[PDB]
Structure formats: C-alpha cells, structure tokens
C-alpha cells in the first residue's frame, strides 16, 4: 500500500534521499534512456505532442520539425495498423510493434502503447524466433519441484540472454527478498541464498512492477534525455512512462547498480494471483542492450514461470 | 492403454477398417504431406539416409543425388548448429529451426528433431513475432473461469490463424469428447456443445498426441509422398514420424475430414499433469498451410492454456 508520490523534480519536487525514497515518482521522470528515442502522440488525431531531445539521432529529422506533425503523415504504412491495434480504453500494457527502415544500418524497432488518450512510441535500433521460448518450456515443465523450477528458469534465461548474472529473487510477506536461484558467469561471486531489505525495492516500485512486467537500465552510467515539452499538452500533467522500457531509471537505483559494479540491469516480474511473487533479476558487467524480440520472449517466459510457480505452490 | 499396432501397409500389414482402426500404426506411414520435403540423416556422421520422393521440387536437386551425402557438405552453415542443438539422447520433441535460401521465392523453413540415432529434417516454403503470443496472454489471464478461458482461447487462436473454425475439444474419462468452446466464421454451423464418441480419436492417436503436441493435415485431398527408402537403414525398421508435422495423416482421418467438408485441419494438445486434457481443434474450408512460425506460436499458446486450465481446475 504505497505512499503518494511527491512532484517530480521538474515540478519543483524535493531531492530524493534515503529518507524519502518510497515517495520518488519513478513512473514520471520526464526523460528516457539515450539508446532509443521516444515520441508521444494524440491517440485520436495522431498529432506528435512530445519528443525526446535526441530524436534526430534516431529518426533522421530535427525534434523541432517532427512536433505537431501527425502520425498519418509520418508513419503512413504503420498508422492504420497502430490505431487498430491500440483502441481507446485498451490495456496500457498492450503493445503494437513494427520494424521500420532507416538510413543507418539494420532497422528501427517501433514499440507503441496507449495510456488514456495518449500514444507512446519508442524507437530503438535493431539488427529471435518463437522457437526459443517453445524449446525452453520443456525443461521448465520437467522440473520436479519449486526450487528445481527456479534453477531451470535462471539457467534458461542466462542461456537466452548471455547476461553475466540471472537471479530469481522471491519476496517474503514483509517485502524483504531472497536470491533463491542464480545462474552466473564462472568466478562471479555468488548472491545465491542472500537476503535483502524491503527498502531495496521500495513500495511504489513493487506496485509499478505488478502492472508493467519488464524494466531495464541498459547503461548504469548513461545520463537521461529530457522529453520536450516535459508535460503532456493534452493534460498539462506529467507523461506516465511506466509502460515504456525507455523510461529513465530512478537515479537512486542507478547509484545502487553502480555500487554493485553492475553495467546493465533488467528484471521481469513474476506475478502470481495478481500479487508480485518475485523477479527474474539480471545483471551485465558492462552496458548492454537486450534486443526487443528477446525482451518480449523473456516477458512470456515470466508469465510461463508465474503459472508453473502457481501450479507447484498449489501442491 | 492402447493396443499394439499392426505392421504398416508397406510391410504387408492389413488394410484399416472401422473394425481394426485402433491398431493403425499412424506414427510410421513411410510418407509425408506433399507441401514440404523430408530427409532423414545419421545423427552422428550426418549422412543423408532417406528422402521423400518429391525432394527435387523443394531442394532443387534430384533425390537420387542427395542421398548418402553428409549434412556437413549439404548444409555447411547449419550443420554445426544443428548438432549442438540436438545432442544424442535429447527429447524427441526438441526442435532446431533455421530459415534457408533457395532459388524459388521466399525462403525455405528448416525444422529438425532427433529420434534415437536419427535426425529428421523437414523443409517447407515460407514467405510472426513473439509479440502475438505476448499480447494474447492478457485476455487469457483475465478470463474469470474455465468456460470463459476456453471462449477467449478459441477466439484468440482464430484471430491469430484466420482458420474458419477453432474449437476447444475436452475429453471425458470414458475418452468421449465435447466441443466446449468454438469461434467460427459467420454462417458456419455450430459444433458448440456437441459430443463425439471415443472412436473418433482412437487410443493410439491420443497416446501420440500426449507426446507430440501439434499435427495437421494441410490438404485433405492431397496424396502422400513416399520416403525412399521406406525403412531406416540404421535399423531396417520403419522411421518414426510422430515428431514430424509433414507426417502423412491416417487415411481414415482424411476421409473423416472430407465427410465434414474440411479442406485443412490442425490441432494442438492441451496436456494437464501429463494427461491429455483436450485439443484446440481447427478447420479450414479449403487447403491451407499455416506458416511454421505461427504453428510454433500456437504450440506455446497450447502450453499457456494447459497451465491456466490446471490453475483453474485447482480452484
Ligand atoms: C531509497 C531507495 C532505494 C531503492 C530504490 C529503488 N530500487 C529500485 C529497483 C530495483 N531494486 C532492485 C534491487 C535488487 N537488485 C539486486 O541485484 C539485488 C540483490 C542482489 C536486489 C535486492 C531491483 C532488482 C530493482 C528492479 C529494477 C532492476 O531490475 O534493475 C527502484 C525502481 C527503479 C526504476 O524502475 O526506475 C528504486 C526507485 N533502492 C535502495 O537501495 C534504496 C537506496
Ligand atoms: C476407425 C477410426 C477412425 C478414427 C481415426 C483417427 N482420427 C484421428 C484424429 C483426429 N480425429 C479428430 C476428430 C474430431 N475432429 C473434429 O472436428 C471433431 C468434431 C467436430 C472430432 C471428434 C481430431 C480432432 C483428430 C486430431 C487430428 C486433427 O486435428 O486433424 C486419427 C489420427 C490422425 C493422424 O494424426 O494421423 C485417426 C487415425 N476417426 C474415426 O472417425 C474413425 C472412423
């Protein structure tokens, strides 16, 4: 049952410390991670309303010029499809995805979702079949018990991602946590069996993670890129970014990651009967962008795992 | 607890009638559906041991010339990967998949699996993201009860496939079945709520379907193409084809499909606690080849559904 948040810093909210961190408004940082670009658009007219400041790097056109243009003009091939895929009032975790062409090598990956009357569009460069998830299910299904399932799950996720460390972190009723399974690079010190206080993942983080099942920090040293304008014109209120993987990570968590010597981090919620049961928590020693298709796979695996857990705890 | 099978027809087995059909050796027809090609190879040397008679249509080289050649020479880029993916003694439902180039438009899709010391390779022409499965999970999860889940499942599968009819067929303890949910093209007569005798899916079919979760008939009027030679040289016994979607369908079932006015059929097992709970059973009015990537998606959905069923029946 999380505290209400304070205003974001850009609305004159207070600085975040270890005394008030459960009130950080992490879903509305007004900025993104610099390895992709983000636009927002009117969900009906398709008019481009906000743009990350770096958008020219990715889209090949100056942020000041793209604004106010409609998606029907900017994405003539994707706009109808995107409209149909994300109707008014659809779930905010529902996504449309397309891979577009661009002047730089490979493609751009486009991910879109809807919050209220706003569409949120994420672009990231890209260079995974249903088969990888399909093949994985077998060992997860054969695991004789919960601990075995967790061991299979982390090993499988490590094999699919290449991440230096993959943990299954399970929450206790006091919201403390414990590393119950771990697959890691040889010689990396074990976190297996270690317990952490509830404060390491504060209540508003756990609440968010029950709604939007995947979040990441691709470079624990990269500075965020502002959304311009920062508020949504539709509303003159902050833009909700919990549904965007590009969302800027809490600086408090960035520092936490750096203190651990973590270069890149990613986790997937394990949600059992609508409650946050735990996290598949992943680390890389250096910055790393997991491709969109792989993240999507990991999301589905998180759901598969949730159900298998729920099956075994009911045994 | 199925009867032992008779020899296949090509070993002088008897003709199959309505009196002896539970003894049809459906897993070893010695032939494939003509919309793809099949080779078998030695699991260690990679030597090509059997070939469907149509293989030149697909592979661009005469069946008599490809035989005895090794996969290390025929597929130099895929052979190492395929070896690594399918080690000796791996599950027979485990698959390797690659998309190859060929002189005819689009690509060839390659699917491989291992049975004992034999590798079975399937080639089919091809022109689906993890996103489709990912997006579907939401409505399946929100369904308040079992009947609602089944209704969501058939509608989702219909939307993903375009099939004229998608049913959820649930088995009773006497092995009779019932159509408990159905999504169908407007004006197609309903099978919803109809019951069928156990004999419609005989015991050796149900046994197979517990092991290999997807099978299909792409053209209920297409004649099968022999494997040449018909027996596996490794063993001078029939080649097990239950793990191959190209496997020729039982002629008894082909006639059953034609009597229903079905042009194309496909089903996915729903397996709950190791038992065959039921089938997502799909029909098209005309012949239709569901792409490999879509079949794989449907397989994963079958597993997702199995777990959700198992969750709700334990409620
Ligand atoms: C005063 C508040 C602080 C708090 C902030 C905070 N932490 C997160 C998110 C995460 N914290 C995690 C902690 C774990 N990672 C580990 O490796 C281990 C143990 C080995 C633990 C206990 C994790 C996994 C997350 C999820 C995100 C991720 O996987 O990287 C947030 C939310 C960040 C965001 O989503 O923007 C916040 C605000 N952490 C505290 O230590 C105090 C200082
Ligand atoms: C004397 C034996 C016969 C028997 C043979 C048989 N049937 C199958 C496989 C299937 N039969 C199915 C029947 C249903 N499809 C439906 O649409 C309905 C009701 C609307 C029913 C009851 C189904 C679904 C299958 C699975 C395959 C598929 O989805 O197409 C086999 C095995 C075929 C194979 O895998 O090679 C066999 C040997 N059917 C009988 O009627 C008697 C005549």
Swiss-Prot record, chains A, B:
Residue ranges constituting the GAF domain according to the UniProt record: 145-309
Domain PAS: 23-91
Modification comment: Contains one covalently linked tetrapyrrole chromophore. Lacks the cysteine conserved in plant phytochromes (at the position of Met-252) that binds chromophore. An engineered sequence used for X-ray crystallography forms a thioether link to biliverdin through Cys-21. The natural sequence can bind phycocyanobilin and phytochromobilin in vitro, but the identity of the natural chromophore is unknown.
Outcome reported for the amino acid change (mutating residue 252 to A): Binds PCB (in vitro), but difference spectrum is altered
List of residues binding a tetrapyrrole: 21
Family under the similarity heading: In the N-terminal section; belongs to the phytochrome family.
Function field: Photoreceptor which exists in two forms that are reversibly interconvertible by light: the R form that absorbs maximally in the red region of the spectrum and the FR form that absorbs maximally in the far-red region. Also has a slight blue shift for the far-red maximum. Could also absorb green light. May participate in regulating pigment synthesis like the carotenoid deinoxanthin which could protect the bacterium from intense visible light.
UniProt name for this protein: Bacteriophytochrome
Organism field: Deinococcus radiodurans (strain ATCC 13939 / DSM 20539 / JCM 16871 / CCUG 27074 / LMG 4051 / NBRC 15346 / NCIMB 9279 / VKM B-1422 / R1)
Gene label: bphP
């Amino acid at each position: 049952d999380p505290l209400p948040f304070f205003p974001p810093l850009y609305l004159g909210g207070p600085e975040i410390t270890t005394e008030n961190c459960e009130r950080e408004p992490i879903h509305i940082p007004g900025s993104i991670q610099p390895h992709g670009a983000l636009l927002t658009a009117d969900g009906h007219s398709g008019e481009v309303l906000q743009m990350s400041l770096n958008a020219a790097t990715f889209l090949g056109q100056e942020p000041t010029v793209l604004r106010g243009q409609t998606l029907a003009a900017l994405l003539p091939e994707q706009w109808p499809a995107l409209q149909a895929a994300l109707p008014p009032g659809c779930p905010d975790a529902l996504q449309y995805r397309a891979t577009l062409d661009w002047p730089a090598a490979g493609h751009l990956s486009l991910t879109v979702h809807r919050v209220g009357e706003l569409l949120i569009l994420e672009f990231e460069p890209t260079e995974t079949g249903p088969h990888a998830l399909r093949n994985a299910m077998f060992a997860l299904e054969s695991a004789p018990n919960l601990r075995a399932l967790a061991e299979v799950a982390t090993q499988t996720v490590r094999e699919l991602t290449g991440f230096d460390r993959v943990m299954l972190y399970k929450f206790a009723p006091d919201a403390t946590g414990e590393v119950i399974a771990e697959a890691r690079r040889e010689g990396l010190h074990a976190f297996l069996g270690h317990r952490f206080p509830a404060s390491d993942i504060p209540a508003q983080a756990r609440a968010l993670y029950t709604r939007h099942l995947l979040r990441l920090t691709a470079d624990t040293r990269a500075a965020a890129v502002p959304l311009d304008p920062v508020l949504n014109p539709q509303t003159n209120a902050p833009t909700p970014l919990g549904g965007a993987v590009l969302r800027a990570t809490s600086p408090m968590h960035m520092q936490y990651l750096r203190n651990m010597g973590v270069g890149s981090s990613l986790s997937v919620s394990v949600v059992v009967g609508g409650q946050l049961w735990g996290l598949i928590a992943c680390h890389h020693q250096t910055p790393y962008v997991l491709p969109p298709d792989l993240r999507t796979t990991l999301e589905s695996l998180g759901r598969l795992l949730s159900l298998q857990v729920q099956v075994k705890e009911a045994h």
